[PDB]
Amino acid sequence: RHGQKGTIGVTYRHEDMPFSAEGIVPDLIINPHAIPSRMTVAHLIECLLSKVGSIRGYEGDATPFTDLTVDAVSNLLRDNGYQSRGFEVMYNGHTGKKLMAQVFFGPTYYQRLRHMVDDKIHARARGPVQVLTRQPVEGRSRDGGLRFGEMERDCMIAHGAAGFLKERLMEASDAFRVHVCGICGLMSVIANLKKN
C-alpha cells in the first residue's frame, strides 16, 4: 500500500526459498533497491509493526499523527525473543549455508491489481483488415496489429536500415499494384489481365 508495485519475475518451490531458523519461508521477496531512493520508510515500519502485532495477537494502530514511535514498537519486539529491528538470520535454500547478511523479514499487506499478463499478451501474423484502408485493424479484441508510428520510422533512419523500413511499410502491410499511363501519368488505366 505504499506505491511499491511490481511483477512476478520467477517462481520458486518451497524448498529453494531462504528460510529462517524456525523454518518460516517468505511468500514473496522484494528488492532492497526499491527503498532508499523512493524513501517509503512507512513500508518498513509497517512490516515491523505487523511483526509485533502477529506475535502478541492484535492489529496495531497505524493511524497517522499519533504518539506511536519506532522505539516503542522495537522494545515490545525484543521482549518476545526476536531481534529488535526486525532482522532474522536466514539460510540459503540451495546449500544450507548461512547468508553472511541478515534479512529484514515479516508480514506486509499486499494487494492484487487488475493488470494480468494474459489480458495483455498479443500477437498477429496475418488477419482482418479495415475495409477503407486495407491496413490491419486496431485492437486486441479484433486480432489487431501494433502501430509503427512516426517515432519508430525515425529510429530506422538513424540506424540507416533503409531496406528494412521499406519492407515493413509495404510487403508486411498494405502493398498494392497500380497501373499508370506513360504519357499523362494518371492512374487511369483500364487493365483486363485475362484479356491482356
Binding site: 508495485k5 520508510v41 515491523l48 534479512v103 517515432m151 530506422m156 540506424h159 528494412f164
Partner: protein, 388 residues
C-alpha cells in the same frame, strides 16, 4: 520462430535510436518477454508493468540488415555523448562493490563453482592469493577471470598513491585487477570506464560477453553472501541526533536574526534585488545549507556495514540527499521556485498567526521521514510533491 532468429525489439516512446535494437530470440515457457538486465537503461525500461513490442523481419535481406547494423553489441557506445549507454546495474553493481572489497575472501570449494559459471573460462584455475595455512582467493582475482587479457586502465581518485590507503582508484594490468574497489566509476556507464575500454581493444563481440560474464559471477557470489535493508539502517544513534538537532536549532535562530535585521532596516541589499527578494534569498540559502550540514553529520556517523551506505557508495541507487532526508531532515519545500505562498490572507495555514515569516510557517519540514511529519509539515510536503 526459432532460436537465434534476429528480431527488432522496441519500447515506446522511441526517443533515440537505441529504443530499437535487434535481439536474438530464445524460446522459453511463460508469457513475458525476457531481457538481460543490462539493456533496461537504453530502453528506459523497468518491470513495473511496462510493455514492449517485437517485430519480425520477413526476408533474407532484412535479417542481414538487422544483425549487421542494428544488433545490440554495435550499440554499446552511443554517438550522443561518445560514451557507453549500458553498464552493470542494480543488484550486480551493488554486489560487485561488496565482492571486490579488500577483505573479501572465498574458500576453495566455492571458487570452483564460480570459475565454472564463466562461459569464456579457459579451464585454468588461478593460484590463490593465500597459500598457507589455508588456500584463499580474493574477490578481485575471480572478477579478473571475466576480464579478457591485454586490457590496461589507470585512474586516480583524489591524488592517491600506488599504496592506495583508502582502497580507491583503479589499476588494471593484463586483464588482472591490481588494486581498487570496483564501483560505478569503473563498470558504470561513464566515459573511459571498463566497458568503453574493452570495446576499443577487443571489438563489440568480446565486449558483449563482458556483461554476461560479470553478471553470472557476481549474482552467484551475491546469492551466497546475501544483502538486505531494514528499519535499523535509517536510525542514527542518540549522540548524533543531538548534533543534528543543534544544527537545525541554530539555523532557526539565524533566520530570526535575519527577520530582525530586515524589519529594523539593518539588512544589506543584494545587487539587482529589492528588500523582500534579498530577504527571501538569504533565508533560502541558510535553510538549504542547514539541511546539507545536518545531512553530512548523519552520513559520517554511519558505519561501513550499514546497508543504506553500501548502496549509496556503490552508486547503484540513492545519493547523499536520500540519507539526509530519511535520517536527519527533509528540509525546505519549494513551490514555483519560491517558498510556500500566503494562500490565505497573510498566512499559509489557519493554524498560524498573520505576518509570520518563521521557518515552520513557510514550509520548513524539520522532522525526518523516520521521525514522522507533523500535520502542518505534511500538507506543505504534499504541495511541493503535487507540483512535481
Amino acid at each position: 520462430l526459432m532460436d537465434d532468429d534476429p528480431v527488432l525489439f522496441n519500447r515506446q516512446p522511441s526517443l533515440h535510436k537505441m529504443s530499437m535494437m535487434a535481439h536474438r530470440v530464445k524460446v522459453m515457457p511463460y508469457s513475458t518477454f525476457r531481457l538481460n538486465l543490462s539493456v533496461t537503461s537504453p530502453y528506459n525500461a523497468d518491470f513495473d508493468g511496462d510493455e514492449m513490442n517485437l517485430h519480425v523481419p520477413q526476408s533474407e535481406e532484412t535479417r542481414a540488415e538487422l544483425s549487421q547494423l542494428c544488433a545490440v553489441p554495435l550499440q554499446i557506445v552511443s554517438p550522443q555523448s561518445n560514451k557507453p549507454v549500458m553498464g552493470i546495474v542494480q543488484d550486480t553493481l551493488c554486489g560487485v562493490r561488496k565482492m571486490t572489497l579488500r577483505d573479501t575472501f572465498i574458500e576453495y570449494e566455492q571458487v570452483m563453482n564460480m570459475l565454472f559459471w564463466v562461459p569464456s573460462w579457459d579451464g585454468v584455475v588461478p593460484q590463490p592469493a593465500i597459500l598457507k595455512p589455508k588456500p584463499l582467493w580474493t574477490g578481485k582475482q575471480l572478477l579478473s577471470i571475466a576480464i579478457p587479457s591485454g586490457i590496461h586502465l589507470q585512474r586516480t581518485d583524489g591524488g592517491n598513491s600506488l599504496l592506495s590507503p583508502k582502497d580507491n582508484g583503479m589499476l588494471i594490468v593484463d586483464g588482472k585487477v591490481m588494486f581498487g574497489v570496483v564501483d560505478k566509476k569503473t563498470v558504470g556507464s561513464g566515459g573511459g570506464g571498463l566497458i568503453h575500454t574493452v570495446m576499443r581493444e577487443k571489438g563489440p563481440k568480446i565486449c558483449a560477453e563482458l556483461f554476461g560474464n560479470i553478471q553470472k559471477v557476481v549474482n552467484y557470489w551475491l546469492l551466497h553472501n546475501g544483502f538486505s535493508i531494514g528499519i535499523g539502517d535509517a536510525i542514527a544513534d542518540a549522540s548524533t541526533m543531538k548534533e543534528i538537532t543543534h544544527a537545525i536549532s541554530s539555523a532557526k535562530e539565524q533566520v530570526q536574526e535575519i527577520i530582525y535585521k530586515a524589519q529594523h532596516n539593518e539588512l544589506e541589499l543584494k545587487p539587482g534585488m529589492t528588500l523582500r527578494e534579498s530577504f527571501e534569498g538569504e533565508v533560502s540559502r541558510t535553510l538549504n545549507d542547514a539541511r546539507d550540514s545536518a545531512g553530512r553529520s548523519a552520513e559520517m556517523n554511519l558505519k561501513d556495514l550499514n546497508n543504506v551506505k553500501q548502496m549509496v557508495s556503490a552508486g547503484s541507487k540513492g545519493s547523499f540527499i536520500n540519507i539526509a532526508q530519511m535520517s536527519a531532515c527533509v528540509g525546505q519545500q519549494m513551490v514555483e521556485g519560491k517558498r510556500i505562498a500566503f494562500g490565505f490572507a497573510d498566512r499559509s495555514l489557519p493554524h498560524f498567526t498573520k505576518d509570520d515569516f518563521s521557518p515552520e510557517s513557510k514550509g520548513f519540514v524539520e522532522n525526518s521521514y523516520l521521525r514522522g511529519l507533523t500535520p502542518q509539515e505534511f500538507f506543505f510536503h504534499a504541495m511541493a510533491g503535487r507540483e512535481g
